[PDB]
Design a protein around this ligand. Structure first.
Ligand code: NA
Length: 277
């Protein structure tokens, strides 16, 4: 998939407001001239020279593009097209316009656990699909859980940002993953082999924040946060978890496990009685 479209994107699309700014990536909304349809345009700066640390290596760009090219599931973002100029690879992606799931839930007046599980189940449906493809996201956190559109009765969740996604064909991959300290699994912290299990840890962190609004492993410095992850230093603070069901804590307890091989699997969690009683 090395040679992308080499036309001027401005010839086929108009681009407007910024939607996100990753490092080495900016996302602008855009409208395809030929169809009227709107999309997100992710501009990934190529490093262009192996010595340059301003940009993303081609290998990383090709990895995200071929993982996106493979997936097609209602709970996962769709890739429409890819362009490449002399500075950027441009990913034309499905426009996800409902904002962050947590933003949306922040505006709810109330949230039972029951309501919370119907949004969480969507996340699990999309991860299940990814893992059935032996694809690990590695960057699962609230910023990458979007709503297609909030103004729908029950909105639909979209998993985004496949910049760390990997096909795990050997049962582990061995490389350093630089994710978000609060959500990466202990094995990412300790530069050990990584698998689908790491996403399961991240899911356990999300569920925690989702039910308490507190971050389980968050410390006063980046290294303390990492030390908390690796030590599995978290507690169900009664200040945040007094009215939280036991079945919910058992769910969380089985995902926040340092030994990945003992961590609950995606299909186990879909069968967990907190998810389907
Ligand atoms: Na579905």
């Amino acid at each position: 998939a090395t040679v992308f479209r080499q036309e001027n994107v401005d010839d086929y699309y108009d681009t407007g407001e910024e939607l996100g700014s990753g490092q080495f990536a900016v996302v602008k909304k855009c409208r395809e001239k030929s169809t009227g349809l709107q999309y997100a345009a992710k501009f990934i700066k190529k490093r262009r020279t192996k010595s340059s640390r301003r940009g993303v290596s081609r290998e990383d760009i090709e990895r995200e593009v071929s993982i996106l090219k493979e997936i097609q599931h209602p709970n996962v973002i769709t890739l429409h097209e890819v362009y490449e100029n002399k500075t950027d690879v441009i990913l034309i992606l499905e426009l996800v316009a409902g904002g962050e799931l947590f933003d949306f839930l922040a505006e709810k007046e109330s949230l039972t656990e029951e309501e919370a599980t119907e949004f969480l189940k969507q996340i699990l449906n999309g991860v299940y699909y990814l893992h059935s493809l032996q694809i690990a996201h590695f960057d699962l956190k609230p910023e990458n859980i979007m709503l297609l559109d909030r103004n729908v009765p029950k909105p639909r969740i979209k998993i985004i940002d496949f910049g760390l996604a990997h096909k795990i064909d050997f049962g582990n991959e061995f490389k350093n993953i630089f994710g978000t300290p609060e959500f990466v699994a202990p094995e990412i912290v300790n530069y050990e082999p990584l698998g689908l299990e790491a996403d399961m840890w991240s899911i356990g962190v999300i569920t925690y924040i989702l039910l308490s609004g507190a971050s389980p492993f968050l410390g006063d410095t980046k290294q303390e946060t990492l030390a908390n992850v690796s030590a599995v230093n978290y507690e169900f603070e009664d200040e945040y978890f007094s009215n939280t069901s036991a079945l919910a804590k058992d769910f969380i307890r089985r995902l926040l496990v340092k030994d990945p091989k003992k961590r609950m699997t995606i299909q186990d969690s879909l069968q967990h009685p907190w998810i389907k009683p």
